[PDB]
Enzyme design. Sequence first.
Site, PDB file in Angstrom:
ATOM      1  N   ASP A  63     -50.433  41.452  22.117  1.00  0.00           N
ATOM      2  CA  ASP A  63     -50.240  40.017  22.349  1.00  0.00           C
ATOM      3  C   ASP A  63     -51.306  39.446  23.283  1.00  0.00           C
ATOM      4  O   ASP A  63     -51.751  38.309  23.098  1.00  0.00           O
ATOM      5  CB  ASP A  63     -48.850  39.734  22.962  1.00  0.00           C
ATOM      6  CG  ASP A  63     -47.743  39.460  21.913  1.00  0.00           C
ATOM      7  OD1 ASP A  63     -47.950  39.650  20.701  1.00  0.00           O
ATOM      8  OD2 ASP A  63     -46.629  39.035  22.332  1.00  0.00           O
ATOM      9  N   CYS A  96     -56.550  35.347  11.061  1.00  0.00           N
ATOM     10  CA  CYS A  96     -55.637  35.608  12.162  1.00  0.00           C
ATOM     11  C   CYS A  96     -54.912  34.291  12.411  1.00  0.00           C
ATOM     12  O   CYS A  96     -54.540  33.624  11.445  1.00  0.00           O
ATOM     13  CB  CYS A  96     -56.394  36.165  13.364  1.00  0.00           C
ATOM     14  SG  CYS A  96     -57.957  35.225  13.763  1.00  0.00           S
ATOM     15  N   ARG A 117     -60.062  37.532  16.351  1.00  0.00           N
ATOM     16  CA  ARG A 117     -59.899  38.822  15.648  1.00  0.00           C
ATOM     17  C   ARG A 117     -60.647  38.841  14.313  1.00  0.00           C
ATOM     18  O   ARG A 117     -61.268  39.859  13.946  1.00  0.00           O
ATOM     19  CB  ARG A 117     -58.413  39.128  15.408  1.00  0.00           C
ATOM     20  CG  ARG A 117     -57.633  39.245  16.693  1.00  0.00           C
ATOM     21  CD  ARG A 117     -56.127  39.344  16.468  1.00  0.00           C
ATOM     22  NE  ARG A 117     -55.390  38.968  17.672  1.00  0.00           N
ATOM     23  CZ  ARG A 117     -54.056  38.925  17.755  1.00  0.00           C
ATOM     24  NH1 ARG A 117     -53.309  39.207  16.688  1.00  0.00           N
ATOM     25  NH2 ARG A 117     -53.470  38.574  18.906  1.00  0.00           N
ATOM     26  N   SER A 118     -60.577  37.743  13.555  1.00  0.00           N
ATOM     27  CA  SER A 118     -61.242  37.688  12.249  1.00  0.00           C
ATOM     28  C   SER A 118     -62.751  37.881  12.388  1.00  0.00           C
ATOM     29  O   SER A 118     -63.393  38.536  11.546  1.00  0.00           O
ATOM     30  CB  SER A 118     -60.950  36.337  11.570  1.00  0.00           C
ATOM     31  OG  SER A 118     -59.604  36.215  11.139  1.00  0.00           O
ATOM     32  N   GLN A 152     -63.918  34.930  20.416  1.00  0.00           N
ATOM     33  CA  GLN A 152     -63.342  33.887  21.278  1.00  0.00           C
ATOM     34  C   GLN A 152     -63.418  34.170  22.777  1.00  0.00           C
ATOM     35  O   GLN A 152     -63.213  33.241  23.573  1.00  0.00           O
ATOM     36  CB  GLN A 152     -61.857  33.689  20.944  1.00  0.00           C
ATOM     37  CG  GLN A 152     -61.597  32.875  19.721  1.00  0.00           C
ATOM     38  CD  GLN A 152     -60.089  32.748  19.425  1.00  0.00           C
ATOM     39  OE1 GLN A 152     -59.397  33.730  19.124  1.00  0.00           O
ATOM     40  NE2 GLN A 152     -59.583  31.542  19.536  1.00  0.00           N
TER      41      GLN A 152
END
EC number: 3.1.3.48
Length: 283
Positions: free
Chosen positions: A181, A215, A221-222, A262
């Site tokens: 998370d 994502c 994440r992508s 990010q």
Amino acid sequence: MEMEKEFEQIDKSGSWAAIYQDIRHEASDFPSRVAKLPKNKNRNRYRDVSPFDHSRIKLHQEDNDYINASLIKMEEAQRSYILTQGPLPNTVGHFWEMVWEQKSRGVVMLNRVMEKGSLKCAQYWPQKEEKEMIFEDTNLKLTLISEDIKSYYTVRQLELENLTTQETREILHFHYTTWPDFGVPESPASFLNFLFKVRESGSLSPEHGPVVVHCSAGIGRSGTFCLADTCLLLMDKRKDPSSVDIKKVLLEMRKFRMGLIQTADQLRFSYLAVIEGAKFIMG
Ligand SMILES: O=C1CCCc2nc3c(cc21)C(=O)CCC3
């Protein structure tokens, strides 16, 4: 510089935030006018994450052709990817329309439907064989065929039917279920194992349309997934694998979609994944 020793040099000097901010400063800025039209407000999950006009995927519809999705086309590596946001309640039909129209074989999902107590994307695929899904706005039917649940990821076989033509296709759903998370994984081993399973399926290969990867926003994440894949492929193709510059590859990918990677922690994790992956490829 090479990668593994540039890596230790940034760790020892603690300058990951400064490296990452340089990337943000140098990244391309292109217009995203279609994404910001008022009629598309409920087609975007986040107001600050939009596809560039020049690389956006167009739906084959004359009313409204907009979806929050971008084509990342890597010329030297000879790989293409579609990066998109997690589907919204009012875009699940558009999502499967895109999968159909672009002839994709695989869908890669890097988030859970609920994280941090909040919904990160719609439940856009069926969970039981006998309870199929019909998307009436785009005239598609989706059926769960089989499901294989492993410790770090789940693979599902799905049948997508175009109800207008009665044509059917098999779609593979690759769901990475264990990204934490908060933060990034401590080791890249399970992420790399997952990437290799997607590869082995054919979903990334030229005989199919581009893989669809998402994502929640489709950039973090992508971005890690496609950056690691492309860097490893270039290390296999070139005479001098140490010439592969992960920062340059990331800036090339950011010509096609804003914001890829990010945080500085995601940048460090991408280095770690490519470094470890390059040892397993041989050897
Ligand atoms: O490059 C290759 C081709 C052979 C299959 C394969 N499998 C793995 C890797 C790499 C390769 C990794 O980097 C770690 C996970 C497993």
